[PDB]
Amino acid sequence: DGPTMREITETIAEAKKKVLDVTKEAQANLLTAKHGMTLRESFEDNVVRFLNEARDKAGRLAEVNLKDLNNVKQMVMAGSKGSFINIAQMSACVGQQSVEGKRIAFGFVDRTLPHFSKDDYSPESKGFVENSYLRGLTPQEFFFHAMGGREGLIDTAVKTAETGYIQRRLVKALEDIMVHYDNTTRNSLGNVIQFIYGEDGMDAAHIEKQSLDTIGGSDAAFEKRYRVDLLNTDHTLDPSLLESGSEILGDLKLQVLLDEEYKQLVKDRKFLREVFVDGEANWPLPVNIRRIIQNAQQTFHIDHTKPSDLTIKDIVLGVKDLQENLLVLRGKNEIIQNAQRDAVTLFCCLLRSRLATRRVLQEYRLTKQAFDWVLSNIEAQFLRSVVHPGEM
């Protein structure tokens, strides 16, 4: 529209005034460059920054001005073809044409083209294309755009020519490496590269991004979630959650089991604090527990306001009995079981995090057949997520 075209003209005009002001301050020797660069480098960074800022702002205005009846907006919102840069260069402004990441250098004596003056540092003469593809381009801009196009073609050609050589070196570099029938990655000569493929023994076709609930959350949320007290009123158990809640309260054995589970989760939280120091809880792991829980709730018709028939020993002893069923190595010696525990520690921490008494009795409200079905599905999918021996 008209007003949008005027807003783009003023947007570019303000950037032109900024480049003229920084240009006058640079010619007056009133601007000191920062550490690491010189005056010309900082000046070019300021000019290029202002021009790209004006081009991006004009592209945003041209994007907002368009309605939903346009087809290019439907193709951009569809995610098939088109982007924001395309409509930003066609509807608003092309932008700054740069060669080798720098402005248009002087191919002549102190000037880019023989059609401008010497010692000209104006953005228009240095490669800025203020026109758009809708109204055509000027010759001094079409020439620089042709330089950028040829540079793009040459760069792509070199990247492909080197990409092929890299591909051959990688293929012929990693070829005679496989996994034998012992879950140990070793080449044809018997040299062991990795004692366990991927340091976990899982194929790259059954891993999904999972969230670790042990480190996530504050300390008040951690103690608010993983503490189910029976003899104390700080984190007591709501008796309306389960049918026998009136008999679970006051039990010392189940409270001791809750103490062991809570201490185990705390040790897992310290371990995760030592392993991942960045603070991220999302990591790729096998077996999706959320889909199993949702399939159990939608399968057994598990809704809200429904007392569960589970207890503390069923969930605690159920998880403890499921942790022993996870097997990747079929050995029975010391080193084999040590590698199995060290290769299953993280997954056991995830299962102990997602399979808490409060999380099942409070939120999930799972029953006996639903919980056992979840255990069988977790063990099953864990037995299907194992990498097959003999894969290249």
Binding site: A26, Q27, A28, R40, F43, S117, K118, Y121
Partner: protein, 116 residues
Amino acid sequence: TTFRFCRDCNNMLYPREDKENNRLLFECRTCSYVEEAGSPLVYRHELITNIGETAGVVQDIGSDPTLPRSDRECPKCHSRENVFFQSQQRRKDTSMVLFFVCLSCSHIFTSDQKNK
């Protein structure tokens, strides 16, 4: 630094220390021509070079069509018709301070507002 040449020989005059009268001299090792010293200076390196920025200034610099034109007046003759160009010394750390060249008295006055 701005050394002289010998007479007839025209060779450079190497410095010779005068131990008798304890004074500097200039000699020619080809012949026996030794003249006195008018200055104790001999050598000057001058690391940071600032000259050459205003190189190539000719009497016919005002007839160059490729050069631009400005409207700033000269501090001497007060002529608004002049031709400006940056430093001729080509280097990475060379500043972009303009050099104004008046088209009347041929004076070279710069545009630096910090140091003049």
